[PDB]
Amino acid sequence: NRWSAEKSWAERVSLAHALIGWTKGTGLMGQNDAIVSAVEEAGVTTYTT
């Protein structure tokens, strides 16, 4: 909204919004890794890096 408000920002900066889904890293998610298969059983997709 700030970019849609401020007028002169258009030429300098464009905002590309990306929603990063479930993505499996080893360090932080090392607990979450085992249930990756479990969540994926709901017909949903978890992603590799």
Partner 1 sequence: PGQGIQHKGMGMEVRARSKAARKVWDSADKFTRETLGFSVLHVVRDNP
2 contributes a contact to partner 1 by CB under 8 A: no
Segment contacting partner 1 (CB under 8 A): 5-13, 16-24, 29-37, 40-48?
A: 5-13
d(CA 41, CA 20) in angstroms, rounded, equals: 20
| First and final C-alpha spacing in the chain | 30
- 10 vs 35, beta carbon nearer partner 1: 10
14 contributes a contact to partner 1 by CB under 8 A: no
d(CA 37, CA 43) in angstroms, rounded, equals: 11
Summarize as ranges the residues that interact with partner 1 (CB under 8 A).
7-8, 10
